[PDB]
Each structure stands twice: as structure tokens, then as C-alpha cells.
Amino acid sequence: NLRGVMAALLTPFDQQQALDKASLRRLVQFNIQQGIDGLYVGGSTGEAFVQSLSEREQVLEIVAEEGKGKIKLIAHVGCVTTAESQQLAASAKRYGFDAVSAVTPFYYPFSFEEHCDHYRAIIDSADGLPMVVYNIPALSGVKLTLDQINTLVTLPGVGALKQTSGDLYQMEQIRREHPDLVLYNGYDEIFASGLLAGADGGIGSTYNIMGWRYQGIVKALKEGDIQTAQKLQTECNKVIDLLIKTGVFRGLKTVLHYMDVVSVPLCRKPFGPVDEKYQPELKALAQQLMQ
Amino acid sequence: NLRGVMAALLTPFDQQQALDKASLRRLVQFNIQQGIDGLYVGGSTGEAFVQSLSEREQVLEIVAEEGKGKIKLIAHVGCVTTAESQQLAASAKRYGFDAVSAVTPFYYPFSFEEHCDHYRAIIDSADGLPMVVYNIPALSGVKLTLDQINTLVTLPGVGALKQTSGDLYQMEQIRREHPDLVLYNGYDEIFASGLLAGADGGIGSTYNIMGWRYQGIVKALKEGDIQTAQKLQTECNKVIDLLIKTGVFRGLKTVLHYMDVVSVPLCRKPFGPVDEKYQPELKALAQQLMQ
Amino acid sequence: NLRGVMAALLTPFDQQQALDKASLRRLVQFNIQQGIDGLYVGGSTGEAFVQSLSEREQVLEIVAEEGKGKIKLIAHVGCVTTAESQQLAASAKRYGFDAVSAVTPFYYPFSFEEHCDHYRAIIDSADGLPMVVYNIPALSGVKLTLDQINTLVTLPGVGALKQTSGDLYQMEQIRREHPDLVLYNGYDEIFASGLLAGADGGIGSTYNIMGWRYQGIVKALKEGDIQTAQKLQTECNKVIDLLIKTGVFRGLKTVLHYMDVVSVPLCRKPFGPVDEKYQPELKALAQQLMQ
Amino acid sequence: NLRGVMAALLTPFDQQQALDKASLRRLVQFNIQQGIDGLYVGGSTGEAFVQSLSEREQVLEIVAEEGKGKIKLIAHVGCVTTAESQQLAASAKRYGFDAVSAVTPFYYPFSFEEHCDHYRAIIDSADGLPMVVYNIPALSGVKLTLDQINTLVTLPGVGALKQTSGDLYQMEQIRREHPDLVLYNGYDEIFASGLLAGADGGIGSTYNIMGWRYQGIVKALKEGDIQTAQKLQTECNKVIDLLIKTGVFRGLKTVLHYMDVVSVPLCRKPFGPVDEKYQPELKALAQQLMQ
């Protein structure tokens, strides 16, 4: 039942790179008002890999306060370490999330076997919340086969899969093998094609600023209005071109700033600031998005 | 006017692995009768890189004889040699094909300038026929930037682009920059998602045995009937699943053999024979495709 | 003067997966006694990416306690966060390490400028200790070009380069551009070839169990005995062949366990344990290394 | 006894892009006089993949005619087709070649079983002539594992391996497994390290203009003069640095032109010219290669 359009929450930092809590609550509220189905918290987009476990627990707790039962809450609880994820998995329950998630452990080369035990351990610590297996070869460098994906997605406790892959053949194969699985599209750029291939919904960072567009694409496809599904996608794509040039996280934070949601558009070092040349475009887009 | 669902044509060899002229013709006519929009001849699917120029020119002449005027005919004329490519391009004009096409020359690491001059030299020899730029990084090993792709797609005399890539963000990007461009989807497994992302047609190998499902998806999307564009794409993928186990060129030749179109389902060595274990499955496929 | 045969220190854990302090001191001392030039501490081998900052900081303290003034001591301070890296860089200075080192930040795609800034930021925090730029493309995913390596190596503060790469052409180009640069060979299996190509020392994990052999390779080549240099290199490769099968860190921790250096040969989950079939081979290896 | 330092011959063309037999004869003679142990004809360096069988068979003739008895002779006979390869294998024997060689067929993805079969067929047609497996992952994109290489290297009729990989751990596992095997180092830039890892000689393209330097490295390691072995390799590497700038084949033919050996220094298209700006240096290189 945790199927839908969900924003991969950005984590606002202040001038000295400390977590900015007011803008977090603010971004959460903004995201709710916009009409998004839920929030995926603490993932790549939430700059998790550049924060401590306690900073991560903090953000989890705050978005929980803010988000109770208004929307669906999902905690990316993953670290390279099983114990650390298990700790975050525990907090997630404590704070009342609806599920927990974890990237396939990166950097060190682990065996599929060790990946499966890792998921199992977290699911165990999640004490009840379903798991959302997180696939993203680009960043994790972990290449999974369809067989391995069938095995992972069948572990008891696993309730959904976040496909952050542009392979839409594999997308249809996964839907083919698992008709009832909540399969989420990870690349915003190909959202419409991912849904025609079998995704139920999607989790994305650009959902923070024009979430209604993606909600729009689903409506158009459900009604067979393909040309307007194509219109919304290309409009989303002209934004993604810009964001990729400016750097996605920082660029997103910038627009959100011009929308008076995020006090400081800073990402944490080693991320660098947005190039001044890009502001004109970013303010113009912040303005326009207030459509 | 190169828009359409066009079959990437297999070339039948006899028991002594020499060209089988009777089955080629049987295969041309089979396609024509299947209502395919046209044929792309002499490509990878055609085992072109395992034949001599003469053998290649021969199939050109034979399918022109059989096809000229009934359907659209594109000639894959590319070799690693520019000189040889030109020879085949001149013959394609001579034989009366509607366009000429060529893979980015592979094996040696040429430069993009080198690649541009290469297409220029052939376009020339094609003495009037539109060039179809054929992108297939997988097999060729050439990773073209979208900027690079724009330079080629706008090179004087170029009329289309065979996108054999699964990168569908890049599909919509090309469509966005070139709204009047004939863009063929190259990976059958994602045909429907390719069209949605931008392709206006496609050239694929599995069209030889089920060209109608592919033409059906085009219809279903035009209609706004996604549920059946999906039903059909999964019907195609179940086939592709099998074909990949057995070997796509030999498995297509086998299913077509059981369909009484091709005499010997042999590919040239180094390709090997279909594993007998799959013969009963392919036998079955041929049978049910006579639907 | 940070040239030499340096061991990449393993960090021993107990039954509960907590740092095993006693075994660590024992391991620090084993290396000292085996005659190694120094220790590189808190690296990949040291499972730094699977422990906390305080743990990492703990290990640095203890090894500085144990080995200060006895051998060269380089601290891997690296993290994804520049701020976390800065924290540990300041500690390394406080405990009295000789150099500070940092992997190119991973997971997120950072620009080369962002990488330079990252090193500058850490170098600043090291307040005087030189920096050993650590190039490990396979694990990190950061493909640096030679030019990029030339820039990073010329940054004020940088005194050495840890080339954990098998490209031995780039090894001599680096040596050719930088005659005074300390250039450590990162891949133990190619040690002898790496010294022939320009490396002047090396840092390696296997140095923990048979450091005396790489010392021999350095002696051999200096003395022009390529017969023993090859003799030792194949002997080392025979063990490496094994370790790769068993899993390198765990495999090495088991060998040291049978050498009575390490109490519990465990690695932190996600790593699984050594497979029972390797026990007799490792047991037998540990016994013959007592040579 | 086909252990040695073999030059991968260049194939000279005329202004018209046809063969300059006059210069080929001169090239063969120049390498002989240089002191090369043998010649490898019709490989990538001999622009074989941009030549017809007849042109390749013609080059096989003229050099057998010009160098039989004087030096060792190895005909590269590989084509993607087993048949075209077999045809050339037969001619190699006919013209009296010492050995035969074939690159792992490329472009279409073939299985290992298919590769083994291909080699057997060629081995069969060379009717007694030993086969030199030609491994070159970079240009062919065929990735063989150590086990696969072990199987190829033990196929009956196989006499040697041309290792065109910079993986010097693999070099030594091959030497370790097969102590009697003739192992040719394929990357000129790492020749000295390739030999210290296990190779007994090399087949390289830069040998045409400075083969003596490569003989000197063999002499150097033989005598345990690693210092002059290193001096020599950096001399070779500075040439390689430039050559990679100009384009290696075109650049080789140009210095050879300034050396009077090759009349016209063209490569066949798709290769373009040496950019005008390199002429001075290449001219200068040839000037100094008269050492």
C-alpha cells in the first residue's frame, strides 16, 4: 500500500553546514502541501553519506514529528556497516516510519551472500516495518542480476524495490516476475517510460520542486492522455538538464531557496557552491514553478 | 518519410554456409506480407561482418529485386573501411534503395572528426540517398555524447538516426533538439517506452518473426491504450527472454525455419548451433506465432 | 623520507565486533618486529569505512602509542565528508603521525576542483604533516587522468602518492614528471614490476603477514638479482591467489590468528567469515610463514 | 623457439591508398637489418581490419618472399569469420610462415566455447603451423579469465600467447601455470615490467623504428642491469607519449618516411593525417633515431 509518488527529501544545512531544522520542517510541510504521496528520507539526495548516524537519527525524528500520518514516511537506513543500519532501522521504528530502506553496501567488494544477510539483519532490526531494497549501480558500483534481484526482493520482510536504473527491460522483467511488488522508478528523467514498463510510482529528488508534474504524468497515463504525459516529461526534462549542469542537490536547494523554503542553499563539502552564472536560470525557474 | 517499423533482416546461409538465395527471398516476402514498413538490410542482424563485400552487395541486389517499390529499403553499407563503405553505398544507389546507413567504424579508436569525415565520404557516394546514422555503443564500443550526436544528425545528407541504446533520457533529448528527426528505436525490449520517450519508429531484429506486435504497439499508443501497448510489449519480451538464451540470430532463424521460411537455421562460424534443449521451446514459439 | 615498505594495518575486532585493543598492539608490534618501514593506518585494509570516527581516532591513538618513533606512521584520515576528514587530520597531528593521507571522496560524483579543494581543506587541517594522495580507482570509482594526478601531486602539502593502480605506463609517466615524488606501489601482486616502472616503495595489506618478502624484492632489484626478485614475487602471488579466494582481510586476519597475533579473526559485517575449506590451507600457510 | 623480440609490421600504402609493395619490401628489409628476431604480419598494426583478404594474403606473400629464412615469421590471420581466417591460415603455411595467429573474434558476442572452436578450425587449416593466441581486451572487447586463457593456451596446436594487456599479475599467473609457454608482452610502454613478470619477448609496433632499444632491455635484464633497462624504457616511453599524440600507426609511418623507408606515410581512411604541427617533432625523432 506504500505505492506512489514520493520525494527524496533534501536535508537543509545552514551557513556553517549544521543541519537547519526549521527549513527541514519547512521543506517537509512544503512537500506535504504540494500533494506528494510520501517522503523517502535519508537517502543519496538527503546527503546521508556525508552526515553522522546521529545527524541522520535527528532528521528522521524531525520529519516524523512533522509528517505523522499526514503522508507515507520511508527511512533510508543504509550504511556500509550492518550494525549502523540496524541502529537506524531501530530508530525508524521508534519514530514510527512506515518502512525502512537500504542501498546495497558499497566501497568494499561484498558477495551477494553477504548482501542478503545484510538486508536480513536490518529487516530484523526494523522489527516489523517492510524493507524497500535499493538498487543504484551508478553510485554503489554493485551490479545486480535479475536473478539476484528476484532473490533479494523475495526475502521475508521485503515489500518494495527502488529501481534506480535506466534499464527498462529489467524494469519489465521485474514487474513480470513479481506482479504485486511495489516497484519504484528512480530516474526522474525517464519517469513516464519507467511507468509504462512496470513501475507503480517513483521516488525522486526533483519531486521536491514540481512534484505535481509527476503526479500529473501518472494521471495522464491512467487516462491514456499520452501526449500530455509526454508534455509533462519533457518539461520535467528541461529542468533536469539545468539541474545536472548546476549540480542537482545544490541546484534543487537553490530553487527551494528562491521559493522561500530553504534558508541556505548549501550542500556540505566536498560539494561546492552553484556557479553564479546559473542563478538567472534558477530564479527564473523558481518563479515559474510557482505555477 | 523513412518513418516506420522496419525489420532488421537476417541473411540465410545454406548447409555449406554459403548464401541461400531462395530463403532470403522467402524471408523478404514473409516480411512484406507481415506488413512491415520496410527492411534495413546488411546490418549486424544480417551477419554483415562475417560476409565479403560481394556477398553483401549480392543480398543488396537480391532484396532490391524483391522489395523495390513494395516497402521502404535502407541499406547498411558500413565497414571499418571508408573506401569499402563507399563501394557498398554506390551500389545501394545503383540498386535503388531509399537510404543508406553505416555503423560508427569500430575496432581502432578513431576520433570524432575521423568519424564525421567517414559519414561525409559515404553520404557523397550515396549520391543522393539520406544517411541513417547507426548508434550501438554496446557492439561498436563508441560512446557518443549527445552534443556529438547532434553534430552527426545535422551533417548535410543525414536523414535519420538508429538509436540502439537503452538510455531513454537521451532519447527524449534528441527528440527535443530535433523535432523533425526520424528516430528509430533500436532495442526491441523497450520499443513502447522508446516511442513514448521520442522514437517515431524502430528497426529491430525480432521484427522478422512478429513484426505485427511491434506495429500493434504503435497503434495502441496512438490510441491512448497503454494497457494493451503493455500487454504486447510483455508478449515480445517473453520471446526475447528465450531468444537471448538460445542466441538471437540462430533462434530467429530456427523459429523461422519451423515457420517454413528459412531452410537451414545456421549462422556462419564462429556462431554455433542452437542447443537442442531449446529446440522444443522454439518449435513451440514458431507454432503459436502463427496466430 | 616517507619512502619505504609500509604495511596497510588491519584493525582487529573481538567476538562482539568491537575493537580488540590487545590484538591491535600485538599486530603493531608484530610488524615492528618483522622489520617493516612503517604503517599506513585507517585505510581500506583497516576497514576504516566500516567504523566510526571515534573508533578510527582510537586506533590512531593506540598505534601512535605503540609505534611512535619506532617506525614511519601515515594516517588515513580520508572520508567522504571534508569536515570528517578534517577532524581526523587534526587528531593525526595531535597523536604525532608523520603524514596524513586521504582517498579521493566517493559515492557522490565530485568534480576535480571539488577534489582539489577537499585535499586543500584536509592539508590545512593537518597543519604541517605532508599529504599522501591516495589513488584507488577500482574501489573508489574515481578515474583520475595523469594531468589531474600531476596537479594533485603539485599541490603544496602533498609529499607522496599511493598509486593503487595496475597501469604501469602511468607509473613511469608519473615518475618521469615527478623525479622527487615518493611513489608507493599499491598492488602487491605487481610489486616487483611496479618498482621496475618507477615506484620507490609500496604500501600493502599482505605486508602484515610476509613483509620480509617485499623487503627482499627491494633488496634483490637494487642488487640486480632479478632471479630472486622474481622468485619472491611468485611466492607472494601464490599467497595472494589464496587470499583472494578466502577474502583478503579475513584471510589475513586468520593467518595472523594462527600466528597468535590476532585473537578473533573477524571482520565487521557485512563481511562474512572465512569458509571452513580454507582453514587447513591458511593454517598451513601461517605455519610456513614462520620461516 | 619463437621466443624473441618481434616487430608488428606496418603495411605501407601509396598516394592512392593502395599498397606500396616497394616500401613494404623496404620495411621488411629495414627491420631485418635492425636486428629484429622476426615479424608479425597482418595484425591491428598492419591495418588488417581495413584490408581485404586478398590484400592481406598479398602482404603475406611479399614479406615471406622477402624474409624467409632470414628471420622468424608469424602471420596474423584472424578475421571475425572462422572461414576467412582459415583461408589465410592456409596461405601462411603455403608461403612458409613459421607460425599462425588470430585475435579473438569481435563485434558479435560469442561464447568461450565458440572462441575455442574458432581456434581449433584455424589451427586445423594452418596444417602443422603453431598458433599464437592473441589476447587484446582493449581493442576486441573480449574479456578472458585466467581459466579461459589456460584452456586456450592448452588447446592442441597452440604454441604461444600474445598478451596484449597491462595486467602484470595475470602475466605472472600465466607464466606460473605454463613455464614452457612463449609469452609475448603486447604493450610496449610496459615491456621491461612485462618481462620481469614473466614474458620471454614481445611483439610491438614501435619496434619498427627502434627495435634495438627493446633488444637492449632484454640484454639489460639478462645481465641484471635494471638501471639501463629502465633508462631504455623511459626513452621508449617518451617516443610512445608523442606517438599517442599524433596517432600511433600514422606517426610510425611518418618517422619511417623521414627515415626513407616508407615513401607515402598514409593510413587508410577512416584514419586521417598527422596534424601539421607534429611534423617538426616527428622529423626530429627520426633525425635522432639514427643513433
UniProtKB/Swiss-Prot annotation, chains A, B, C, D:
Subunit structure, interactors included: Homotetramer.
The protein here is known as N-acetylneuraminate lyase
Q: What class of enzyme is it?
A: lyase
Q: Which UniProt keywords apply?
A: Carbohydrate metabolism, Cytoplasm, Lyase, Schiff base
Source species, domain of life: Bacteria
pH dependence comment: Optimum pH is 6.5-7.0.
Question: What is stated as this protein's family in its record?
Answer: Belongs to the DapA family. NanA subfamily.
Q: What is its main location?
A: cytoplasm
UniProt entry tagged with the keyword Ribonucleoprotein: no
InterPro entries with a match to the protein in the record: Aldolase_TIM, DapA-like, NanA, Schiff_base-form_aldolases_AS, Schiff_base-form_aldolases_CS
HAMAP family recorded: N_acetylneuram_lyase (MF_01237)
GO terms assigned for molecular function: identical protein binding; N-acetylneuraminate lyase activity
Subcellular location, in the record's words? Cytoplasm
| Role description | Catalyzes the reversible aldol cleavage of N-acetylneuraminic acid (sialic acid; Neu5Ac) to form pyruvate and N-acetylmannosamine (ManNAc) via a Schiff base intermediate. Experiments show the true substrate is aceneuramate (linearized Neu5Ac), which forms spontaneously at alkaline pH. Linear aceneuramate can be provided by NanQ. Can also cleave other substrates such as N-glycollylneuraminic acid (GcNeu), but not colominic acid or 2-oxocarboxylic acids such as 2-oxohexanoic acid, 2-oxo-octanoic acid, 2-oxo-3-deoxyoctanoic acid and 2-oxononanoic acid.
**Residues annotated as site: Required to correctly position the proton donor:** 44, 107
The UniProt note on temperature reads: Optimum temperature is 80 degrees Celsius.
Reported effect, residue 44 to C = 40-fold decrease in catalytic efficiency for the cleavage of Neu5Ac
Task: Kindly summarize what the UniProt induction comment says about this protein's expression.
Answer: Negatively regulated by the transcriptional repressor NanR. Induced by N-acetylneuraminate, via inactivation of NanR.
User: Which residues make up the binding site for pyruvate?
Assistant: 44-45
What results from changing residue 189 to N? Answer: 6-fold higher specificity for dipropylaminocarbonyl-substituted derivatives
BP terms from Gene Ontology: carbohydrate metabolic process; N-acetylneuraminate catabolic process; single-species biofilm formation
Recorded catalytic reaction(s): these are:
aceneuramate = aldehydo-N-acetyl-D-mannosamine + pyruvate
What NCBIfam families does the record point to?
nanA (TIGR00683), PRK04147.1 (NF003164)
Q: What results from changing residue 107 to F?
A: No significant change in kinetic parameters for the cleavage of Neu5Ac
Pfam families on file? DHDPS
- Gene Ontology terms, cellular component aspect? cytosol
